[PDB]
Symmetry: C2
Subunit: 287 residues, 2 copies
């Protein structure tokens, strides 16, 4: 393979296509969109407008990391969009998993379209890989997943991105069973951070590792009196590419640390359960 040649030719292609016009891209923080953004940025510089939407369902430290990486370090013309209120308000009273995803998808498009109209770009860059009135450009169209990761590394993207575990577009909203509220998202966000921290501390490299707020209540104690507490499910799986996946045989000490930290550092949680179901028969997420 020759990545230097690939980059030179692809950057040239984007330049010849865009000309002096503006191009826009949705920056999700994922490896695909990140890689496509870097190629487009090398091609047209400030004429590339990278739009990053904070949905309110991102992981701890994620928004800050994306801004630091793309605005500060890569110097991209980034549009940080805080749309948290729109997403949370739109989900009020919605408990059905499918409906939640539908609403989140609709609001994301509404937000992106609103910002895009102000930008007035003529081209839309997408990180589509092999595996708005805008002309489409897909720089990674002929590349497979493993190749995109190699390219991302070659382009100087952080390992935190090219080796990241996949994370759903609706984010933490699908990690909360039932109605999505700021409090539930706060709890699962902290629990998720603990899960990832313990997996990292033990040098484990699973396909996915996350926490889910089940909605099931258990009787705990806060001060010196009984109170209802939440239940968190921990999901850690091993997989080649998600086709099938096995619940991971996590060292007991790691599971103990996760359970201890979640219930001690997040007083609102009183019980932690570990998912031991493979795929098949189960899905990886809890939807």
């Amino acid at each position: 393979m020759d990545w230097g040649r690939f980059v030179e030719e692809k950057v040239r292609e984007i330049r010849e296509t865009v000309g002096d016009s503006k191009a826009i891209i949705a920056l999700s923080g994922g490896v695909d969109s990140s890689t496509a953004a870097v190629l487009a940025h090398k091609a047209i510089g400030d004429r590339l407008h990278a739009v990053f939407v904070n949905t309110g369902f991102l992981r701890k430290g994620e928004p800050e990391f994306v801004v630091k990486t793309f605005r500060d370090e890569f110097g991209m013309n980034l549009h940080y969009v805080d749309a948290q209120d729109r997403f949370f308000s739109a989900l009020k009273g919605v408990t059905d998993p499918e409906e939640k995803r539908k609403i989140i998808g609709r609001v994301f498009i509404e937000v992106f379209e609103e910002v895009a109209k102000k930008i007035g770009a003529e081209y839309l860059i997408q990180g589509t890989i092999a595996p708005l009135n805008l002309k489409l450009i897909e720089p990674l169209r002929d590349l497979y997943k493993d190749e995109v990761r190699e390219l991302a590394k070659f382009l100087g993207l952080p390992e935190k991105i090219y080796n990241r575990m996949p994370f759903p577009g609706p984010g933490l909203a699908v990690r909360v069973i039932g109605e999505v509220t700021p409090e539930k998202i706060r709890i699962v966000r902290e629990a998720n951070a603990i899960v990832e921290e313990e997996v990292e501390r033990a040098g484990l490299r699973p396909w996915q590792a996350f926490a889910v707020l089940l909605g099931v209540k258990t009787v705990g104690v806060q001060g010196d009196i009984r109170a209802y507490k939440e239940t968190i499910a921990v999901r850690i799986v091993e997989s080649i590419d998600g086709m099938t996946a096995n619940a991971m045989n996590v060292p007991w000490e790691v599971l103990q640390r996760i359970a201890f930290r979640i219930t001690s550092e997040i007083p609102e949680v009183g019980r932690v359960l570990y998912d031991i179901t493979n795929k098949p028969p189960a899905t990886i997420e809890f939807e």
Copy 2:
């Protein structure tokens, strides 16, 4: 000791009839055998099938006390009454309160027909408590000496409300059936693997999810497996169960109980969590 207590009971009861509630627990069982050796045919044991007992449990109790020990055993099928009384009840406290109220109504109903004058209780009508001076460990030894099955004197504790508190939310016949089957799988695999925990059981969580086979839009149930080690039950730790055993439990539950599509294992100690979920 046996000769002494049997003598005391025989002197207290005289030629009157006595009644005792058989729960299947070591305490009531041991007290029942002592009372039976004392007044034989004048002891009337009462077994109430609440509808929340474990798989094969009712049959075991009847076979053990009525056939094996030859006691007068009044079997009461009150499943319908308990399920009706719990219809729509979600609060754990109310479930326990209602089950207690119904048990009494059912028991007092059967006690009237017997016409007993003494009530035998396994506390550790006139009351008779032959084990009021014995501790948990002592009662177990006595049970062994009396000839009670190991399945009883060494059995894990099981709550009065039974499987009703092993179902989060409203209790219904179908939910109890599902958790009864899951519970049997958990106990079977834990025993087969040589595990000897304080308690090992299954809980129907109420949370539902879709799977990746067959009708992928059909929401299925979730079972939580609870296995803990404890000395006294005051403090306990989630057990470090061998992975292959947990995998077998998950496989059997989803393969044998089509209604369940997800299995979770509780990894929380006590404190901060309770052993039972409700």
